[PDB]
Amino acid sequence: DRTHPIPDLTGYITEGQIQLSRELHRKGIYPPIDPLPSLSRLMNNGVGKGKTREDHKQVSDQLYSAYANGVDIRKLVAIIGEDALTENDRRYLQFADAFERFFINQGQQNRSIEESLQIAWALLSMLPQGELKRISKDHIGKYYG
Amino acid sequence: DRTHPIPDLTGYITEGQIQLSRELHRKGIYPPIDPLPSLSRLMNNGVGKGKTREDHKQVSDQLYSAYANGVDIRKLVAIIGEDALTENDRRYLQFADAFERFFINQGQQNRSIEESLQIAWALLSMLPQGELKRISKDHIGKYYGQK
Amino acid sequence: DRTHPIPDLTGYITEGQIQLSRELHRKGIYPPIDPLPSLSRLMNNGVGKGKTREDHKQVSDQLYSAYANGVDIRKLVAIIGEDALTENDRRYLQFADAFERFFINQGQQNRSIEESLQIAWALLSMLPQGELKRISKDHIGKYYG
Amino acid sequence: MAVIADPETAQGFRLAGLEGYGASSAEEAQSLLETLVERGGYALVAVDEALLPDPERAVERLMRGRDLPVLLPIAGLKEAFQGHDVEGYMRELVRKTIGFDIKL
Amino acid sequence: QVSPTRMNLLQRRGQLRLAQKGVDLLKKKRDALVAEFFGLVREAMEARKALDQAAKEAYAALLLAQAFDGPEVVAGAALGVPPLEGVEAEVENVWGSKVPRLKATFPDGALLSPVGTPAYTLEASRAFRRYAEALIRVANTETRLKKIGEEIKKTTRRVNALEQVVIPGIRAQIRFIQQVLEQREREDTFRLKRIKGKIEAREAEEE
Amino acid sequence: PGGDMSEPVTQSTLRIVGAFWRLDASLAFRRHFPAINWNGSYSLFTSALDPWYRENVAEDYPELRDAISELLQREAGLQEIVQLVGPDALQDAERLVIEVGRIIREDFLQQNAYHEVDAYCSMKKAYGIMKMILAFYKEAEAAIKRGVSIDEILQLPVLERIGRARYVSEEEFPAYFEEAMKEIQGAFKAL
Amino acid sequence: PGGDMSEPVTQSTLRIVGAFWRLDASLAFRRHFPAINWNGSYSLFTSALDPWYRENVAEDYPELRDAISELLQREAGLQEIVQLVGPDALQDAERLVIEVGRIIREDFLQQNAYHEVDAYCSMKKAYGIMKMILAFYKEAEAAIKRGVSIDEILQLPVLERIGRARYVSEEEFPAYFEEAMKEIQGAFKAL
C-alpha cells in the first residue's frame, strides 16, 4: 500500500515513484508497472520539441486519459456484464488490455523512444479520431494510424 | 459523522438536534436545514392547544412523512421515468420540490409562527384530502384549500 | 466470527471444532450443529474395524460429500429458477432437507451409534448407487436397504 | 410469419396468406420448427399446443440471442372444443415466469 | 482500499449507506414493476380469450368451407397467394431493453377473386385475417409480459445478492478497521504511561 | 502523513481558515489537473465577494455560478444511482445532466499549466465559458422535452468548440465568444 | 447510543440477563402500544415457569402459548409475498394466517395503558383471550376447506366480541368467556 509511513514519506521527499502492481504481475506481464499510481515530476522539463520529440507530452496525457477510462469501465463491466457496453466503450475496453499486453509487456528488450512512441500511436489508432481530445490537431494528423 | 465523540456526547446530553446539510446548501437554500434527520425530543410537550395553535403537532407530522416519501420518489424517478408513476406519486414529487424551496428556502425574512403555518397548509394543499392521513378531520376541514 | 482471539487461539491448540450455526437454530433444529465448518482433526484412529462398525469412515465421508453438494445446489437454486435443474439435483435437495430434518434434529433422545449409522444409511438410500462414490461396493451390498 | 399445427390447420393459414406447416408427431414438429428457424422467416412462429407445449427450446438452443422468431403455444381445433383452459395457462405462465403461483 | 486509515473507515461507512439506500430503491422499482405486471397479466389473458373466440369462429368457417366446397378447390384458391409478408419487429424500450413489437401483415388490401367464385371459402379468407390479427396482438402483449417478469426476477436476484453479500462484507471490513484503529490507540495510551513514568521517576526522586 | 484529512494539522487548520481547497488522488491518478475534490472543498468568501463580482465582472454573475454549483450537485447526486445500476436505465433528462457535468469537468475546470494560453484565465473568459455551457444545457433540455434522441445532441459540432473554448487567447476571446453563442443558438433550431 | 448492539455494555448485559425485551419505535410509530417487538425479544424463563402455569393458570397453558408463538412466527415469515403481491391475492389458508395474526396483534398484544380495565390483565383473563382466538382459528382453518369463503369468515360478528374481550373487568370476565366460546361454536356451526 501507499499509506505505510515508508512509501508515504518517500514520496513526499523524492520526485516521482514507479509502482509495480501485484495485479498485473499475475498476468505474466513484465515489467509489471502500472501507470496510474506512478509518476515522475521532472517529465515536463526534459521532454518536448528539440529535446525528445514534439508530440511526447501530449501522447503521455492521452494515454493516461484513455487507459484510465478503460479501467473505470472495467469496474462497470464487473456488474452489468460485457454485453451491455455500447461502442466507443468496447474500444476503450480493448484499448486497455491491448495496452497492457503490447506496451507494458516486453521481455528483456531495449526499445528506443521512436519504437515506444510509434507503438503508442499504434495503440491510440484504435480510438476514433474525434475522441482524442487532448492532442493538438497537427500531431493527430501526421501520426494517426 | 455523528459517531465522533463531540456530536456523540453532545447529542447524548442535549435533546434533539437540528442538522444542516451540504446538499441543500449546494442547491442554494438558506437556511439549509434538512428536517429529515432533525429532531426535538421536547416539541411534543411544548406545542399544541393554548401554547401555540391547535393543529401544530399534526401539521408537523404530516409535513415530515409527506416530504419523507417525496424524497424517495424523487430518487426513484431518475430511473423510472416520470410517465410510469401514478398520479399520487407525482403529486408527492411536486410536494417535495416546492417544499424545499418555499418552506425551507426562507432567505433572511422573519416568519412568525402563523405565517409558517399558513405556508404549511398551502404546501399540504398540493395533496388531496384523505391523502393527509395523520391530520384529524377538523383541521383538514378548516385550513385546507389555500394557494 | 472465528477471527476473534478466543475462537482462533482455541483453534490452534485443539484438535478440530464443532461449530453450532445460527441459521440452523432458527428452523427449530436441535442440536444445531452444522456439519460443514466442523471437523475432527483426529478420528482416523477412533473409527473403523472393531472400534466402531466397519463402514464408519466411508459413511461419514459420503454424508459430508452429499450434504456439501446439496447445500451448494440450494445456494444456486436461490439464484436460478427452481425448475432449471437436472434429475440428480432434486435428490440432492431432498437429501439435504431429509438430512437436516432427520439426522441433525434429534431433539432429546439418546441415539446409539448404530441408530445413527442406520439413519445414515436410511438417508443414503435416497440416492442412486452411482452417486455413491466413496463407499466401496461391499458395504453397498451389505447395507443400502 | 409461420404456423405449425396440422395440414388441415395449415391450409387455412395458407388461405390467409400466411406460411403454414404441419407435423403429425412432436419430433417432426420440432423438425419443421428447426426448419423455419434455420430459414429465418419474418419473425413470428405459432405452434399448436398438442405438438409442442412450450416451444421455446429450438430458439433458446439455436437463436439464444436477438429474441426474434416469437414463439406462441397456440391452441388446436379438436382441442378448441375445450378452449385451452386459458386461466390454467395463465397460472402456468406466471408460475413459470416469476415462480410464485397465487390467485387472481 | 482496505489499508486501514481513519479515512478509509469513513469512506466505508459512506459506502455502507449507499448500499443500504440502494436496497430500498431496488425494492421500490420492483414493487412499481410488479404493480405494472399485475396490470398486464389480465390484459394478456383477455387477449387470449378474444383469441379463443376468434379461433372458434375461424375454424368453424374453415371446416364448413372444406366440407361443402371441395378440398381441391380450396387448395387451388389458397395456392394463389397474396404476397403474405409485411410483418416487422419495430422498436420498443422497456426498462433498459429493446423488445420487438410486431406490426400487422397487410396484403389484405390486395385480395383475389373480386367475383368470389366459391362463397364459403372467401368467408374463411376473411376469417383467418382476423385470426392472424388477434394472433399478433397476443404476441406483442405476451412478449412484453415475458420481459417485465424476467426483469423483475433479475432485480430480486440482484437485491438478494447485493444485500446478503455487500452488506455483511462491508460490515465485516468496518469492524476490522475499527479494531485496528482501537489497537493503535491502545498502544498510544501505553506509551503515554511510559513517558509519564519516566518523567516522574526522574524528576520526582533523582538524587 | 497518511493522505487523510483526520490529522491534528489538517483538522486544526480547517477550523481557522475559510477557503479550503482539497486536492485528491483519483483525479491525480488520471491526469486531470488541478486535482480539486469538488465535494469536500469550500469557501466562505463568496457572499462578501458578491458585490465585487456584480460590479467588475458582469451583472448576472453570481446566479450563473450558483447554477454551475447546482449542476455539479445534481451530478454528485446522480452518481450514486449510476454506479448502482449503470448508465443503463437513466432517462433522457438525467443522462443529459451527467453529460453536462462531465463536459464542465473536462472543459471548464480542467486546466493544464503548460499550454501557453490557458495557464492564466481572466474572469471575463471564465464567465464566458460558464455562459456557453449554461446556454448549451438550457436549450438542450428544451430540445429534449420537444423530443429528440440525446445521442445526436452529444455529437454536434458545437461541443468541440465549447471544449476548445478554454484554449483560445484572452485577446481574441470575445470574438470567439460571440461566434460560439451564435452557433449555440443555431445548432438546436435545426433539431 | 446508536441502536448498536454488540456495544460492550449491551453485550455484557445480554450475556447475564434472563429476559430481553426490545422496544422498536416502528411499532410505536404504527401506534401499537406496548411497543415490544416479538421478533427480537426473547425469554429464558419459559422452561422453569412450566409447572407453575400448569398448576395455577390452566393445565394446557404452554401448549397454546407455543401455538400462538409459532403462529406469529408464520405471519412474520410469509409477510414476504404479502409485500410482493398484497394481502388480497394469497392462497386461502395463508390470508387466514395473516388475518389471525392481525387479530392477535390487535387484541392480544396491543394494550391501552390508560384505560382503567385494559391496563391490568391477569393470567385467567389472558388465557381466556388466548384460547378464544386459538379456538376461532382452529375451527376456521377446518372450515375454509369444506364450506366457506374468506369473506364469509372475516365478516362475522363474533370478531367484534373477541375485539371487545380485553375491555372486560376480571370480576365479570369468565361469564363473558363462556358466552364468547359457545358463540364461536354456534356461529361456525351456522355456515
Side-chain angles (χ1 to χ4, degrees):
Chain A
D1 50 353
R2 287 177 57 174
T3 322
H4 187 75
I6 311 306
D8 190 76
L9 296 182
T10 303
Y12 279 113
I13 288 112
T14 63
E15 41 195 354
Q17 76 273 10
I18 47 173
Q19 175 172 356
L20 312 183
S21 70
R22 180 69 59 81
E23 182 176 359
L24 273 67
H25 173 71
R26 296 182 186 179
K27 296 168 189 172
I29 303 173
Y30 183 88
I33 302 171
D34 54 349
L36 258 62
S38 64
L39 78 155
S40 179
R41 305 182 201 274
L42 305 180
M43 182 169 71
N44 305 317
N45 294 114
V47 304
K49 57 178 70 178
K51 56 181 72 173
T52 298
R53 202 174 78 184
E54 63 271 12
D55 55 348
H56 192 184
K57 189 187 288 183
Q58 304 174 4
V59 161
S60 169
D61 298 330
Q62 192 70 46
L63 257 69
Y64 276 111
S65 171
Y67 172 77
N69 203 0
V71 174
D72 75 346
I73 206 166
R74 288 174 180 172
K75 291 189 292 182
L76 189 273
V77 171
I79 58 100
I80 204 169
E82 192 182 3
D83 201 4
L85 307 182
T86 67
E87 70 174 359
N88 76 28
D89 300 327
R90 291 184 182 272
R91 288 179 289 179
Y92 279 152
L93 182 60
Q94 292 173 357
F95 179 78
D97 53 359
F99 180 79
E100 300 172 357
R101 291 183 292 110
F102 295 113
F103 184 75
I104 294 170
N105 188 4
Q106 64 180 2
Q108 290 292 323
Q109 66 190 1
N110 187 359
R111 297 190 296 185
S112 69
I113 190 60
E114 280 80 5
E115 288 290 327
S116 294
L117 288 174
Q118 74 179 1
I119 291 167
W121 282 107
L123 294 171
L124 281 176
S125 70
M126 297 177 184
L127 271 301
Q129 178 181 354
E131 183 70 31
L132 283 70
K133 68 182 73 176
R134 295 184 188 182
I135 293 173
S136 179
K137 302 293 182 66
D138 48 358
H139 312 99
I140 207 169
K142 63 188 292 294
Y143 297 109
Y144 184 75
Chain B
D1 49 350
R2 195 175 288 166
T3 58
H4 191 79
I6 297 163
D8 195 2
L9 303 172
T10 296
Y12 189 64
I13 302 168
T14 57
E15 292 170 351
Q17 70 272 9
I18 61 173
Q19 186 171 7
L20 307 187
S21 72
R22 283 178 186 84
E23 182 175 2
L24 280 78
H25 169 68
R26 286 170 179 170
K27 292 178 182 293
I29 284 171
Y30 181 71
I33 292 171
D34 53 341
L36 297 175
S38 297
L39 181 59
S40 178
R41 299 173 66 93
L42 200 62
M43 177 181 69
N44 295 313
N45 303 116
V47 297
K49 180 68 175 67
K51 300 181 182 70
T52 165
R53 206 180 76 183
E54 184 179 1
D55 55 347
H56 189 280
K57 186 173 72 176
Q58 293 172 355
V59 166
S60 173
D61 289 330
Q62 182 57 47
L63 282 169
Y64 179 75
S65 73
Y67 174 70
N69 61 1
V71 168
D72 54 359
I73 289 175
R74 176 184 295 166
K75 195 189 292 182
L76 180 65
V77 84
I79 53 172
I80 289 294
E82 200 273 336
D83 56 356
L85 289 168
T86 70
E87 180 65 28
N88 199 0
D89 296 335
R90 181 179 295 116
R91 298 183 65 83
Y92 277 103
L93 192 149
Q94 290 181 352
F95 174 75
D97 205 3
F99 176 78
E100 71 184 6
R101 64 175 181 84
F102 289 100
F103 189 80
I104 300 175
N105 187 352
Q106 181 175 358
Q108 288 181 354
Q109 62 173 355
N110 193 358
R111 287 177 179 171
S112 64
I113 187 64
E114 296 91 2
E115 298 182 357
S116 297
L117 293 172
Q118 72 181 353
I119 289 170
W121 282 108
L123 263 295
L124 284 180
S125 298
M126 292 188 291
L127 305 183
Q129 300 191 6
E131 184 68 30
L132 277 59
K133 294 183 182 293
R134 298 181 185 272
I135 309 166
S136 176
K137 184 59 70 176
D138 297 333
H139 306 109
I140 299 173
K142 283 177 91 286
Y143 297 97
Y144 188 81
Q146 180 51 253
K147 193 182 85 174
Chain C
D1 49 351
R2 294 175 294 114
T3 73
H4 199 269
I6 297 306
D8 65 10
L9 292 175
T10 301
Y12 283 112
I13 313 169
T14 58
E15 302 288 333
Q17 70 269 15
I18 287 174
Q19 180 170 355
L20 271 68
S21 71
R22 177 74 71 187
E23 195 275 331
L24 275 302
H25 173 71
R26 296 174 293 174
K27 294 187 286 184
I29 295 171
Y30 177 75
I33 292 170
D34 59 349
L36 273 82
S38 70
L39 87 162
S40 175
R41 190 169 298 120
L42 297 177
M43 86 176 280
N44 287 326
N45 295 319
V47 301
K49 170 64 173 64
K51 306 169 183 177
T52 53
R53 203 173 72 193
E54 287 178 351
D55 55 350
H56 189 192
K57 182 178 87 273
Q58 304 175 2
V59 166
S60 61
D61 193 4
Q62 192 64 46
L63 285 172
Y64 185 69
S65 67
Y67 189 67
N69 200 356
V71 75
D72 195 2
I73 198 66
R74 71 183 174 182
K75 183 180 286 185
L76 187 273
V77 158
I79 300 301
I80 204 167
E82 297 180 353
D83 189 77
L85 76 166
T86 176
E87 177 63 31
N88 57 9
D89 296 337
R90 270 66 164 265
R91 287 179 186 87
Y92 281 160
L93 294 174
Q94 292 174 358
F95 173 70
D97 293 332
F99 184 80
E100 67 192 3
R101 294 298 177 185
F102 294 147
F103 192 75
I104 301 169
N105 191 8
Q106 73 167 359
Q108 197 52 248
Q109 54 172 354
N110 185 357
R111 288 182 182 171
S112 181
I113 188 62
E114 289 91 0
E115 286 185 351
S116 295
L117 282 175
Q118 71 178 359
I119 288 295
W121 284 105
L123 293 172
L124 290 179
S125 296
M126 292 177 181
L127 299 173
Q129 297 186 2
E131 296 288 328
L132 270 61
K133 301 304 291 183
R134 280 84 178 276
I135 308 175
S136 70
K137 292 181 288 298
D138 198 3
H139 304 290
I140 299 301
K142 293 167 69 70
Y143 300 102
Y144 194 85
Chain D
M1 296 175 68
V3 305
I4 67 100
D6 210 14
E8 184 177 0
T9 307
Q11 55 194 357
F13 288 90
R14 298 189 296 107
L15 172 136
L18 205 150
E19 176 71 26
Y21 297 107
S24 60
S25 66
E27 180 177 1
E28 188 175 357
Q30 188 170 1
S31 299
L32 272 299
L33 180 58
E34 186 169 2
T35 304
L36 203 276
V37 163
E38 292 292 330
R39 307 294 186 92
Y42 301 163
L44 192 145
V45 169
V47 171
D48 192 1
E49 190 271 331
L51 277 306
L52 267 71
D54 47 356
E56 295 178 352
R57 277 85 175 92
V59 179
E60 68 89 17
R61 190 259 181 275
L62 195 278
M63 198 181 288
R64 182 175 176 267
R66 291 180 66 187
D67 204 75
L68 187 60
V70 184
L71 292 162
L72 283 87
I74 207 170
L77 68 157
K78 312 169 294 298
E79 194 267 334
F81 282 103
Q82 288 88 20
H84 187 78
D85 197 3
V86 176
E87 296 180 354
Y89 173 67
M90 188 52 72
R91 295 283 303 275
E92 180 180 359
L93 179 62
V94 181
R95 185 184 178 87
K96 184 179 175 68
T97 302
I98 64 102
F100 297 147
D101 193 2
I102 34 88
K103 268 62 182 295
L104 282 83
Chain E
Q1 56 182 354
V2 77
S3 71
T5 64
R6 177 71 66 187
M7 192 180 72
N8 287 110
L9 178 64
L10 274 73
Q11 193 269 334
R12 293 297 179 185
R13 288 179 188 170
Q15 189 70 39
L16 182 63
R17 284 188 301 276
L18 290 184
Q20 290 174 355
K21 291 183 283 188
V23 167
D24 200 5
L25 177 139
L26 260 58
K27 291 177 180 178
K28 195 176 264 77
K29 173 169 70 175
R30 181 179 62 199
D31 197 7
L33 292 183
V34 159
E36 182 164 357
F37 181 81
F38 290 145
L40 278 175
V41 60
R42 56 169 302 279
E43 186 174 358
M45 79 191 295
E46 290 181 355
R48 286 187 72 96
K49 290 173 189 175
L51 192 274
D52 193 6
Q53 183 176 2
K56 192 59 183 174
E57 67 87 17
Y59 289 119
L62 197 274
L63 284 174
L64 266 64
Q66 291 188 4
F68 288 165
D69 200 9
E72 200 278 329
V73 297
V74 74
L79 261 295
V81 282
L84 185 148
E85 58 94 24
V87 285
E88 59 89 18
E90 62 193 357
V91 181
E92 286 297 319
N93 195 0
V94 277
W95 280 263
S97 60
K98 179 255 169 66
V99 299
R101 188 263 303 279
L102 274 77
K103 76 105 178 174
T105 312
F106 280 160
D108 203 7
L111 288 179
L112 294 176
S113 189
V115 179
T117 47
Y120 289 152
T121 295
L122 75 95
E123 182 171 356
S125 70
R126 186 60 60 85
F128 279 95
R129 175 65 61 186
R130 285 189 294 275
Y131 192 75
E133 191 68 31
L135 186 63
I136 64 99
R137 182 175 67 199
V138 164
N140 62 7
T141 293
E142 284 186 353
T143 184
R144 291 177 184 266
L145 192 145
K146 292 297 186 293
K147 297 292 290 185
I148 286 299
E150 64 191 5
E151 172 68 28
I152 283 170
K153 69 178 293 185
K154 186 273 314 295
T155 283
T156 301
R157 74 191 187 180
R158 186 174 174 181
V159 167
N160 299 322
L162 190 146
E163 201 275 332
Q164 293 173 356
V165 175
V166 317
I167 292 298
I170 290 299
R171 291 178 186 178
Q173 292 179 356
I174 285 173
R175 288 187 301 276
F176 174 71
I177 293 173
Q178 285 173 349
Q179 181 58 48
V180 53
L181 293 174
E182 287 176 356
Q183 189 187 358
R184 294 177 186 171
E185 187 181 3
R186 193 181 298 119
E187 293 175 353
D188 279 332
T189 182
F190 179 62
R191 294 168 187 169
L192 286 174
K193 295 181 74 67
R194 287 183 66 86
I195 297 168
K196 188 175 178 181
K198 285 177 65 177
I199 192 167
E200 188 173 0
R202 178 177 292 169
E203 296 175 352
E205 66 187 3
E206 184 66 24
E207 193 269 329
Chain F
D4 52 347
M5 290 74 167
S6 297
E7 292 288 323
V9 181
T10 300
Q11 289 186 355
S12 175
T13 197
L14 68 89
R15 296 194 307 267
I16 62 172
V17 306
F20 177 80
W21 298 327
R22 181 173 180 174
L23 292 163
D24 63 345
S26 298
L27 297 171
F29 282 168
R30 63 183 66 200
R31 298 294 183 267
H32 177 271
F33 297 113
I36 298 295
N37 192 3
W38 180 71
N39 200 6
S41 300
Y42 67 97
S43 175
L44 298 177
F45 300 97
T46 67
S47 68
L49 289 176
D50 187 3
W52 193 79
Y53 286 155
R54 290 183 185 270
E55 186 68 26
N56 295 117
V57 187
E59 177 68 29
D60 49 350
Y61 181 81
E63 299 88 0
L64 186 73
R65 180 186 66 198
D66 299 337
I68 286 292
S69 288
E70 68 185 3
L71 261 63
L72 288 177
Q73 170 57 44
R74 290 178 65 186
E75 181 187 5
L78 268 293
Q79 282 297 107
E80 176 182 5
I81 311 300
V82 77
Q83 77 174 357
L84 197 138
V85 169
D88 190 77
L90 289 178
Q91 301 300 317
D92 286 329
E94 314 302 316
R95 189 178 292 160
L96 180 61
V97 169
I98 292 298
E99 295 294 323
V100 174
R102 183 184 57 84
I103 200 168
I104 294 168
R105 289 184 287 112
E106 288 187 357
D107 292 325
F108 176 70
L109 303 173
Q110 186 186 5
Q111 182 180 3
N112 57 351
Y114 297 115
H115 191 284
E116 293 179 353
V117 186
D118 188 74
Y120 180 69
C121 187
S122 64
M123 288 197 294
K124 294 294 185 180
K125 186 173 175 182
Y127 176 74
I129 301 168
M130 290 185 294
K131 197 174 177 182
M132 284 183 277
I133 298 171
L134 260 293
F136 167 71
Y137 173 73
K138 182 179 71 66
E139 298 175 357
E141 75 180 3
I144 208 167
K145 63 96 182 178
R146 190 172 65 191
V148 295
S149 177
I150 179 172
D151 302 333
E152 69 178 359
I153 300 172
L154 300 171
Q155 293 175 355
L156 291 165
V158 72
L159 268 71
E160 190 177 4
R161 295 182 67 254
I162 295 171
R164 300 286 184 177
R166 62 187 180 92
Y167 286 158
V168 301
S169 175
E170 292 169 349
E171 297 173 352
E172 66 185 8
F173 197 78
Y176 187 79
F177 180 67
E178 293 177 357
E179 179 68 31
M181 289 300 290
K182 264 59 177 296
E183 193 169 2
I184 198 59
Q185 189 182 4
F188 287 157
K189 187 58 66 66
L191 268 291
Chain G
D4 192 71
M5 282 74 76
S6 180
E7 184 176 0
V9 187
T10 312
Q11 185 177 359
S12 303
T13 292
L14 295 183
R15 189 174 302 120
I16 54 178
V17 288
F20 167 66
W21 295 337
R22 290 181 69 249
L23 277 82
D24 275 327
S26 175
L27 276 80
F29 181 73
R30 291 192 295 271
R31 298 176 291 112
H32 180 275
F33 294 104
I36 309 295
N37 196 1
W38 57 89
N39 292 320
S41 300
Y42 58 96
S43 171
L44 285 92
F45 298 104
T46 60
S47 301
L49 296 173
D50 196 357
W52 191 83
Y53 288 159
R54 287 185 183 272
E55 296 167 353
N56 298 118
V57 185
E59 188 69 27
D60 57 350
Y61 185 84
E63 301 297 322
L64 60 158
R65 177 175 65 183
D66 299 332
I68 282 181
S69 183
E70 75 180 6
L71 201 151
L72 266 299
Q73 183 65 39
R74 192 169 298 114
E75 179 192 8
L78 52 88
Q79 71 176 356
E80 178 65 35
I81 72 169
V82 175
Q83 290 300 107
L84 186 140
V85 175
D88 205 2
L90 264 294
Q91 295 283 325
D92 299 334
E94 294 175 350
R95 184 176 168 183
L96 182 58
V97 166
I98 67 101
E99 176 62 33
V100 177
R102 177 257 187 192
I103 190 177
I104 286 169
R105 291 185 287 109
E106 292 188 357
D107 199 74
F108 187 65
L109 298 183
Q110 183 170 358
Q111 182 174 1
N112 189 2
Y114 292 115
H115 194 195
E116 57 89 19
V117 59
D118 183 64
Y120 178 68
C121 183
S122 69
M123 285 293 173
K124 298 289 178 182
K125 179 179 181 179
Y127 177 72
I129 298 167
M130 183 169 176
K131 185 194 285 185
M132 195 189 296
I133 294 171
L134 200 63
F136 178 82
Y137 175 72
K138 69 181 70 172
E139 287 183 357
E141 190 181 3
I144 55 168
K145 301 182 268 75
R146 62 97 173 175
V148 292
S149 173
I150 297 167
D151 203 5
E152 294 181 354
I153 291 174
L154 277 68
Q155 295 297 116
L156 203 153
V158 185
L159 276 296
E160 67 175 1
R161 289 171 67 91
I162 295 175
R164 286 179 183 175
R166 69 190 192 186
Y167 292 145
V168 174
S169 176
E170 295 189 0
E171 296 181 353
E172 295 176 353
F173 181 75
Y176 173 74
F177 171 61
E178 296 298 321
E179 291 180 356
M181 189 179 176
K182 269 66 179 299
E183 186 172 358
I184 288 174
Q185 299 177 1
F188 267 168
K189 186 260 188 296
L191 291 172

